[PDB]
């Protein structure tokens, strides 16, 4: 071509990122007034827009700084804006627009624009011929070039448009991709929702769920589906019983005073209160500052109790009074639970312990109270005279085991003494009757782990209603007994029996304090404090869930832990399979199998809100030598809104057929009133390069069709005329639109294509093989029909021509099988040869005539019962003269060549 850049030397722009330059640079240059400047070289992308560059700095001494946005516009004098939609539907004819911009001040441009061929699309551009148009873009202006394409195969396909100007070294190219989507509509089916619980719903600790394959009955042919296996964990908080409210303990802060017994009576509530509030961490509501004074009181009580410590390291109500066994044991108890709060002297505690072993323990091993305490209300359940030996032993023993870790180093006879006490409780435990004694002796034995067998059975069956160790008498004795039993269950790790006990204790609302609350105040809060200690915050979650797909070689496993229980674990599989899921471990989960696919749509896909009819007719009459140009046609457009009311302001987007332009006079007549509007910008434009048009409507009726029409003149002549298009929509919504095509020949403006089911092939190539029969020889015919591509070579006779609105059918009788391929057709059978209507006049196939036809195996179309032939670009179709015609001297060359052709093919065939 002259004075233009060749097509092959133009590299289309393709780098159109929405964001880029995600880079990191360090400012290491020698500072200048504290600022270190770094010059950075960057490669711009192909987009023609403005980039906003944002900067964020991170310094050791200066911290983080977000700079102001720096805008950098990128542009060219001449470029292509290829406007592609996000997606398009397979096999639906669409029109795209390439808008050419010329931003030169005073220079018009003669431009040639080409749409590159793509096998995945159907357009006038083929592998053999190009789709060009030579337009003129005035200075400081733009021009729109419509291209009509049909997506053939799904997936990410590519569109490439190039352009070069004449008489200048100025070119541009745009290459963009779009998503091609199956005809059907996006659907998902909930295949399965199963509850995962191996310890509860599983056999032998494993749970196997069988998932059926999805229905997929309305699945669109030749569409893929994706099945999602969604594993999630079910975290379950284990319901720790609510701790006693901090306000209900305000009264337990008492100043200790009195003598050997009255001092401990006042010291008990304070020590256990701090012990409980410390464990439950409720000093926030109680008052943080108050805890300090509370400690001073415990110290006070302790110091005052040292005054009653007899030289034998024992304790009694008065210095002269004989040392009491129970009082010394109880002081050990309280002092042992208070070592974590204040400074408790070891000599005091350990001396009392060594005393009780050596002075009040018999050989059998049982503790004896040789001086009963004066306050009989501070001992609680031991008042009930029955089984003093068993009860008092349990009490003293518990005080020993509680002071074990402190006084095991100093007191050497402690382990042996604990063991002797344990023997007596073990021996006569089963002969107990009083619920209280079974409770207190049960906790004394559970601390050693000697509460098993029938003994543990008696401890559990003595609990009435499985939640309280109750005995006829004062309720305070029963509260103490149930507290001892709860401490035993927290020692026996029997968390299956603990919730009922604890719940009953909280329902009593007993907050300690009052006449003879000593035991019931200490024990209930010690048991509850130990309950909040051993209380385990959450049910253990550790799921091992393994999938098993038939199409996977190995096993996909997932470990659902507590720390990541809510994490959605998705595993996708393209095959619609039935599979096995095996879960094992503690905890709970949820399994959701959901399969996405493409479903056939009952509901209309296109033109849901608008009816559009477009007609193109030969205009009549015609004048002489004014008008605009030669050949004139009439475009008529009729639209109706599919609603209950009239439509509001609407847009008519009309693209001309290649070589046509609207008549100015008709447009000026439409634009005048009548609730229509065509802008002056459109009316001022010249007759050339006016291939797009927008008619604005004030409203369109819903009751009937609103119709307009105008004349279009042909100013440019082209061998292939591209169909024009009309797109109606309402201004408030561009998606609810309708688009129709018109082409004078081709009805309904549609391009030529052959569709069945959902696979369409392009039929816009050459009608057949046109060459000049003189130029053809015998070697030419022999070389082409011997190619491996050529599947069949037949001598046929055209029996019948069935004319149709879309494709012409040529019923041919296979007279002779010169070369057979896939089709095993016999002499005498008939085959139908299909061809586009544009070719009917170019082939001129008449009945009762003969033809030599050969073609590719890619020209097959059907299934073996109804196998048809497609006359494509590679289909050889030559007229075969009859025997009486071969005697003539004009047909001599063809007859000799054809007879030889048959002979060589029949006898010798292809050399290979």
């Amino acid at each position: 071509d002259e004075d233009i850049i060749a097509e092959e030397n133009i590299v289309s722009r393709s780098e159109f990122p929405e964001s880029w330059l995600w880079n990191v640079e360090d400012l290491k240059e020698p500072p200048k007034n504290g600022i270190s400047t770094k010059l950075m070289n960057i490669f711009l992308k192909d987009s023609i827009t403005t980039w906003e560059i944002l900067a964020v700095s991170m310094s050791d001494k200066k911290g983080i700084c977000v700079a102001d946005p720096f805008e950098v516009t990128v542009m060219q004098d001449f470029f292509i804006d290829l406007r592609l939609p996000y997606s398009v539907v397979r096999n639906e004819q669409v029109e795209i627009r390439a808008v050419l911009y010329n931003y030169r001040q005073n220079q018009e441009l003669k431009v040639r624009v080409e749409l590159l061929h793509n096998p995945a699309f159907c357009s006038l551009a083929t592998t053999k011929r190009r789709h060009q148009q030579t337009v003129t873009i005035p200075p400081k202006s733009s021009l729109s070039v419509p291209y009509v394409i049909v997506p053939l195969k799904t997936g990410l396909q590519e569109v490439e448009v190039k352009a070069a100007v004449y008489h200048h070294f100025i070119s541009d190219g745009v290459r963009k991709s779009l998503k091609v989507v199956p005809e059907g509509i996006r659907m998902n089916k909930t295949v399965a929702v199963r509850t995962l619980d191996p310890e509860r719903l599983g056999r032998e600790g494993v749970q196997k769920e069988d998932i059926p394959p999805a229905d997929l009955s309305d699945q669109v042919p030749d569409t893929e589906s994706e099945t999602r296996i969604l594993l999630q964990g079910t975290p379950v908080a284990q319901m720790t019983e609510d701790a006693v409210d901090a306000e209900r303990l305000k009264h337990l802060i008492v100043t200790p005073s009195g003598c050997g017994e009255q001092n401990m009576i006042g010291m008990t509530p304070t020590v256990i209160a701090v012990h409980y509030l410390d464990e439950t961490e409720q000093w926030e509501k109680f008052g943080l500052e108050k805890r300090q004074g509370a400690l001073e009181l415990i110290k006070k009580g302790y110091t005052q109790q040292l005054a009653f410590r007899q030289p034998s390291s024992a304790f009694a109500a008065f210095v002269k009074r004989a040392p009491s066994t129970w009082l010394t044991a109880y002081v050990v108890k309280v002092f042992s639970l208070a070592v974590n709060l204040i400074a408790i002297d070891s000599q005091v505690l350990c001396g009392a312990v060594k005393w009780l072993i050596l002075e009040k323990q018999k050989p059998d091993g049982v503790f004896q109270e040789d001086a009963p305490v004066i306050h009989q209300e501070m001992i609680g359940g031991l008042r009930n005279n029955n089984e003093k030996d068993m009860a008092l032993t349990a009490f003293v023993l518990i005080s020993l085991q509680e002071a074990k870790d402190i006084c095991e180093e100093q007191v050497n006879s402690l382990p042996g003494s604990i063991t002797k006490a344990g023997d007596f409780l073990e021996a006569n435990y089963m002969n107990l009757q009083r619920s209280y004694t079974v409770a207190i002796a049960g906790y004394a034995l559970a601390q050693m782990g000697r509460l098993k067998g029938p003994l543990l059975n008696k401890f559990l069956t003595t609990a009435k209603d499985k939640n309280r160790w109750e005995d006829p008498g004062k309720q305070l004795y029963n509260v103490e007994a149930t507290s001892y039993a709860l401490l035993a269950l927290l020692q026996l790790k029997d968390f299956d029996f603990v919730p009922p006990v604890v719940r009953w204790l909280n329902e009593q609302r007993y907050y300690g304090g009052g006449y003879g609350s000593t035991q019931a105040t200490f024990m209930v809060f010690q048991a509850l404090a130990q309950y909040q200690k051993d209380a385990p915050d959450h049910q253990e979650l550790n799921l091992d869930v393994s999938l098993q797909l038939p199409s996977r070689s190995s096993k996909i496993t997932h470990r659902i832990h507590w720390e990541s229980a809510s994490l959605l674990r998705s595993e996708e599989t393209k095959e619609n399979e039935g599979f096995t899921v095996t879960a094992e471990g503690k905890g709970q989960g949820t399994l959701s199998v959901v399969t996405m696919y493409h479903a056939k749509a009952k509901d209309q896909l296109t033109c849901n809100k608008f009816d559009l009819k477009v007609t193109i007719k030969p205009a009549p009459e015609t004048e002489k030598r004014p008008q605009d140009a030669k050949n004139t046609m009439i475009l008529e457009i009729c639209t109706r809104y599919r609603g209950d009311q009239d439509a509001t302001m609407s847009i008519l987007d009309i693209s001309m057929m290649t070589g046509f332009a609207p008549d100015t006079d008709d447009l000026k007549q439409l634009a005048n009133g009548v609730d229509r509007y065509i802008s002056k910008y459109e009316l001022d434009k010249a007759f050339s390069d006016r291939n797009t048009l927008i008619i604005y409507l004030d409203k369109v009726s819903h009751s009937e069709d609103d119709c307009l029409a105008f004349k279009v003149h042909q100013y440019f002549n082209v061998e292939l005329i591209q169909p024009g298009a009309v797109k109606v929509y309402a201004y408030y919504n561009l998606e609810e639109s309708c688009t129709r095509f018109y082409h004078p020949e081709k009805e309904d403006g549609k391009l030529n294509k052959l569709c069945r089911d959902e696979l369409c092939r392009c039929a816009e190539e050459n009608c057949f093989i046109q060459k000049s029969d003189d130029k053809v020889t015998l070697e030419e015919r022999l070389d082409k029909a011997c190619e491996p591509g050529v599947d069949y070579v037949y001598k046929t006779r055209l029996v019948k021509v069935q004319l149709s609105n879309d494709f012409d059918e040529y019923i041919m009788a296979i007279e002779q099988t010169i070369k057979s391929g896939s089709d095993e057709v016999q002499v005498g059978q008939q085959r139908t040869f299909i061809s586009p209507i544009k070719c009917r006049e170019a082939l001129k196939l008449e009945e009762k005539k003969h033809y030599l036809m050969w073609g590719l195996s890619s020209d097959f179309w059907g299934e073996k019962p109804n196998l048809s032939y497609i006359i494509g670009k590679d289909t050889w179709v030559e007229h075969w003269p009859e025997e009486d015609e071969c005697q003539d001297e004009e047909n001599q060359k063809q007859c000799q060549d054809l007879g030889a052709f048959t002979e060589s093919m029949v006898v010798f065939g292809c050399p290979n």
Binding site: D1, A343, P363
Partner: protein, 367 residues
């Protein structure tokens, strides 16, 4: 002209050119050599006696290659130029933490297009880590022994009764190796604390978990809040603070009358005492003579008379004080046969004496 048109540096001949001398007005078409572009053919003309240029403005420029394309997690730079023309080289470099896959790291704009493919950057990976002995890996994200990549951090937590030894956390560093070494889980142990202004009460030096350490404060000093420390996996909590012969041997059923101490030295002495009703035999006081303790005494076992054993022999206590009675070593006990019984064959006396836990019960065999 009397020659052929000169073979240009960026152009090529298209005609046969077999004659020697050429007439006037002959046009010599120069084709644009591979990797160059022009609006049309650069045509030369012979006139007078030289091959002039008919198209002085039309020249062959360098062919434009497209944008070489950016690769994920990597940038590029241009070599031998500042425009994407024929003859430049685009060298790629992966970001920090990303390593190149393959051996081709450049793209050379040739006559056809960009040479080779766009390089690919992969994130560096660390070797998988196994759970340490007596410990687990709480962190990470699922999958036993899956290859970690750059950045991912790992934490180590021992089981109960063990404390960590080494760095606690780590992460996959830049070179594909972990930032810290794999630690160890050792049993929790504590040494004897050095209490300031104080002295230890206990004897043991090595301590296990939850074992308490008892101490006293020197004169002039007193306990700071608490009076003892506990061995925890982190140390002694709280810490001991004072603000301003060996131990005697143990005896069965008895102890010493004083608080034991650590060292006694020769000439020291301690007194022993048995449990209640137990009888002591030997020197009640032991003495340290030449780094050795004297023979400590022993506690003789008394006898317990239970109603359960008396019922089997059909015998009862003469002076009915229980149902149970204790007898020290050397004490005698008097029984009587229950009503309707006789002294039996294998009995001789109803009065027997207890000797170090052995008492002969009389039997009555019913008359």
């Amino acid at each position: 002209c009397n020659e052929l048109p000169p073979r240009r540096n960026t152009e090529i001949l298209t005609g046969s050119w077999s004659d020697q001398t050429y007439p006037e007005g002959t046009q010599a078409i120069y084709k644009c050599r591979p990797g160059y572009r022009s609006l049309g053919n650069v045509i030369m003309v012979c006139r007078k006696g030289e091959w002039v240029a008919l198209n002085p403005l039309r020249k062959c420029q360098k062919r434009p290659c497209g944008h070489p394309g950016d690769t994920p997690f990597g940038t590029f730079t241009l070599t031998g130029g500042n425009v994407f023309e024929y003859g430049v080289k685009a060298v790629y470099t992966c970001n920090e933490g990303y390593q190149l896959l393959g051996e081709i790291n450049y793209r050379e704009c040739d006559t056809d297009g960009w040479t080779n493919d766009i390089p690919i950057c992969e994130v560096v990976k660390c070797l998988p880590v196994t759970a340490p002995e007596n410990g687990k890996i709480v962190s990470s994200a699922m999958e036993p022994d899956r290859e970690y990549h750059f950045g991912q951090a790992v934490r180590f937590v021992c089981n109960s009764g063990y404390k960590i030894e080494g760095d606690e956390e780590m992460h996959c560093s830049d070179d594909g190796f972990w930032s810290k070494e794999k630690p160890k889980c050792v049993e929790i142990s504590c040494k004897s604390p050095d209490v300031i202004n104080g002295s230890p009460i206990s004897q043991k030096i090595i301590y296990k978990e939850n074992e308490r350490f008892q101490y006293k404060c020197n004169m002039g000093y007193e306990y700071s809040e608490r009076g003892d420390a506990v061995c925890t996996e982190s140390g002694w909590r709280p810490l001991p603070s004072c603000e301003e012969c060996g131990p005697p041997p143990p005896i069965d059923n008895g102890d010493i009358t004083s608080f034991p101490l650590s060292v006694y030295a020769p000439a020291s002495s301690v007194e022993y005492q048995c449990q209640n009703l137990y009888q002591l035999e030997g020197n009640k006081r032991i003495t340290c003579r030449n780094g050795q303790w004297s023979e400590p005494p022993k506690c003789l076992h008394p006898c317990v008379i239970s109603r359960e054993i008396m019922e089997n022999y059909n015998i009862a206590l003469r002076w009915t004080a229980k149902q149970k009675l204790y007898s020290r070593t050397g004490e005698s006990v008097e029984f009587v046969c229950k009503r309707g019984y006789r002294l039996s064959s294998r009995s001789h006396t109803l009065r027997t004496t207890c000797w170090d836990g052995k008492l002969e019960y009389p039997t009555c065999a019913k008359r």
